[PDB]
Amino acid sequence: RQSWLPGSQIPAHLDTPAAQALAGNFGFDPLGLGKDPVALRWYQQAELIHCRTAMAGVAGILIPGLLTKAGALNVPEWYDAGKVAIENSFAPWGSLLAVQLFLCGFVEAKRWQDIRKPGSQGEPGSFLGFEASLKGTSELGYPGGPFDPLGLSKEADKWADWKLKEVKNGRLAMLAFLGFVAQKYATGAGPVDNLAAHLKDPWHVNYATNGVSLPFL
Amino acid sequence: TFGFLYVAGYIGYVGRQYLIAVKGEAKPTDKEIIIDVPLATKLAWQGAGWPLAAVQELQRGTLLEKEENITVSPR
Amino acid sequence: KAGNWLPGSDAPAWLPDDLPGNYGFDPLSLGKEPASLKRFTESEVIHGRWAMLGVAGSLAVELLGYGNWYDAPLWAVNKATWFGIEVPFDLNALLAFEFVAMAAAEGQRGDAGGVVYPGGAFDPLGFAKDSSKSGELKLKEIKNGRLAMVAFLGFVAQHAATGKGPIAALGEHLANPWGANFATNGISVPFF
Amino acid sequence: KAGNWLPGSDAPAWLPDDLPGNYGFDPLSLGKEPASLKRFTESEVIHGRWAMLGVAGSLAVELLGYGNWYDAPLWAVNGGKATWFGIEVPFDLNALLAFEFVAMAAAEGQRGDAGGVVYPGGAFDPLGFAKDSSKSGELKLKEIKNGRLAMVAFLGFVAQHAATGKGPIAALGEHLANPWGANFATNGISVPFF
Amino acid sequence: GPKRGSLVKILRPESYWFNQVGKVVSVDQSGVRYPVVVRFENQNYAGVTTNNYALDEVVAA
């Protein structure tokens, strides 16, 4: 099957009904960190979290920064946008900080209790009407109701397809964020500008030429 | 201090890894003297995730030996 | 079901036909549990009635020339007047009275289990003494309640965008629909 | 249990359902022994009642314009004369001290004379509101709830004053003026690195 | 009693392999007070790797 490395052997725990049935498996586990079932399940959830968060972040970086290259939508650099926003704001940053901590903490605790017991927050009467749709959809990391409103989880055909594309694009978004911050440390410039420069001359616009990544040269 | 503790836990963990691997053998003394070069290299490569592995085994409580080790007669 | 909420579609199983305001509309399957469902029925009716009464008062004010719904709090949160007639009382007094009164009323409503049609004292003229005309009444009632909700939404959104009275924006769109609209406002949708 | 203290969780075995103020809340398993448990029940109720009465008096003072709870000792532990309801008290500080002490001594001695009673009634319910055995149950539930609330309210008072130094009503109107400007985070004392 | 070659845990406190496991070589069917014959893999401070035992001092584990 599609392997992260042909010829090489497949990790046993990765070569399992659950794992190969999880998503996007390629036998990629050199250090063998998901031999425990609970562990690999936790890591699957973790990878999901990171995928989605990174997708969101890279979108919020590029699209506004992309259209600021366009005439409209004058937005600052992403890293300075924090300063820009706290300037243009009204509430103190520590305040709004603590508030959003409360907010995220509650729902994160929800996700937590549900991972502990899939039928945990379905506890009837615990909320007024939540429990009904607040139950999982038999796949931890795939809730229902408000989650998937349009009802795209019902058609099994495109199911694994959505899944594979999800995990793919999420990992790629992680990598995108990493490249952005890395070239912000090295080049110090916005990623769009880094791209423009590498377009103007790839032969001389690269980490090979930065003398930063590879200083021994 | 942080770098020190990192490398130290790494080395200790991989030591116990090889130790368990060779305790799972029929010639414990002979593997204690002559070593399995490739298994050593493998555990060395894998030993980076020693802290995450250890905390996993703790949450599973599989690190420590149960109350069956030899005791002295007066305990 | 008062008609197919969606031509060509089907109906939710847990949704029974015998219900005013039903059209088969729960694509997203919230009320599938019975107690939750009946609670939704009750709350839906209650909100619709509240909103009906509210839009009624708003239009009454704006037609009798007392500003708008948005105008009302002004005199107080910065003297009272109603029907053009003042009210010789304190803001805090009206606040406390209103609060305790609504407290008692809602407590007494919620004292009962889930009643939605008490009647008797709640139908002095006995218009619910028919059990079928009452059915049509329920249907038209929930319809009108939903309409009153959406009407209030229109009011509050037109004011959040423009800041004007509903009658104001009314006569505006009357003067020119092509010039008096959210698109011409360009606020509801930015890239216009 | 008045409801799941933790949706999705379970309940402690030694914790029986038949208890006001129960929600399944003892994750840390302190009251697992019976006598200790019932002692905790009693003490919990007693502390809640004390705190209820206390926050009552505090708010009464601060609403009737006599400083705050923190204001009260001032006149006595420094130069000054007693005053209550705006009315002075023509007595000595040491006198009030001794009287209060011996009185509370007698009262607590008489309370602790009994075994572990929490609901004497009779003389302790002259109006006989406990003559129902079920309304009394709801009374116990709401009672322990309100007592816990009064405890936490007193904590809020004392902590706001240890940080700011102001009356609870003072910090009230402050947060009313601006919540984004009147808060422990804006105070930055409850949390230093702000 | 236990079978030959079977694995038993030693419980005789004064034994080197106390609180440990051994392998039943055999068990006598005569009136010997200690018929269980149990080898060991680690040697004692005497170097011996097998000792005699009554039935109770061992347990099939």
From TrEMBL, chain A:
Keywords: Chlorophyll, Chloroplast, Chromophore, Photosynthesis, Photosystem I, Photosystem II, Plastid, Thylakoid
Binding site for chlorophyll a 18: H198
Alphabetized Gene3D superfamilies for the sequence: Chlorophyll a/b binding protein domain
Residues that coordinate or bind chlorophyll a 6: H50, E108, R111
UniProt-annotated binding residues for all-trans-violaxanthin: D29, L31, W78
Residues engaged in binding chlorophyll a 2: W4, F28
Record-listed chlorophyll a 12 binding positions: G144, E166
GO-annotated biological processes: photosynthesis, light harvesting in photosystem I; response to light stimulus
Positions annotated to bind chlorophyll b 3: K83, L134
Binding-site residues, chlorophyll a 3: F26, G27, F28
Residues involved in chlorophyll a 17 binding: N194, Y207, N210
InterPro entries listed in its UniProt record: Chloro_AB-bd_pln, Chloroa_b-bind
Residues that bind chlorophyll a 16: Q183, Y207, N210
Binding site for chlorophyll a 5: W42, H50
Residue numbers binding chlorophyll a 15: N169
SUPFAM superfamilies recorded: Chlorophyll a-b binding protein
GO cellular component: chloroplast thylakoid membrane; photosystem I; photosystem II
Stated role: The light-harvesting complex (LHC) functions as a light receptor, it captures and delivers excitation energy to photosystems with which it is closely associated.
PANTHER family, A to Z: CHLOROPHYLL A/B BINDING PROTEIN
Family: Belongs to the light-harvesting chlorophyll a/b-binding (LHC) protein family.
Descriptive protein name: Chlorophyll a-b binding protein, chloroplastic
The organism of origin for this protein: Chlamydomonas reinhardtii (Chlamydomonas smithii)
Origin organism lineage: Eukaryota, Viridiplantae, Chlorophyta, core chlorophytes, Chlorophyceae
Gene that this sequence comes from: LhcI-4
TrEMBL record, chain C:
Binding-site residues, chlorophyll a 24: N144
Record-listed chlorophyll a 28 binding positions: H173, N181
Cell compartment(s), UniProt: Membrane; Plastid, Chloroplast thylakoid membrane
Record-listed chlorophyll a 7 binding positions: R39, S43, E106, R109
Residues annotated as binding chlorophyll a 30: S188
Positions that bind chlorophyll a 16: G119, E141
Residues engaged in binding chlorophyll a 12: T81
Family: Belongs to the light-harvesting chlorophyll a/b-binding (LHC) protein family.
Protein name: Chlorophyll a-b binding protein, chloroplastic
From TrEMBL, chain D:
Listed name of the protein: Chlorophyll a-b binding protein, chloroplastic
Gene that encodes the chain: cabI-1
Gene Ontology CC annotations of this record: chloroplast thylakoid membrane; photosystem I; photosystem II
Family: Belongs to the light-harvesting chlorophyll a/b-binding (LHC) protein family.
Binding positions for chlorophyll b 3 per the UniProt entry: N146
Cell location: Membrane; Plastid, Chloroplast thylakoid membrane
Protein role: The light-harvesting complex (LHC) functions as a light receptor, it captures and delivers excitation energy to photosystems with which it is closely associated.
Coiled-coil positions: none
Organism, as annotated: Chlamydomonas reinhardtii
InterPro entries tied to this protein: Chloro_AB-bd_pln, Chloroa_b-bind
Pfam families: Chloroa_b-bind
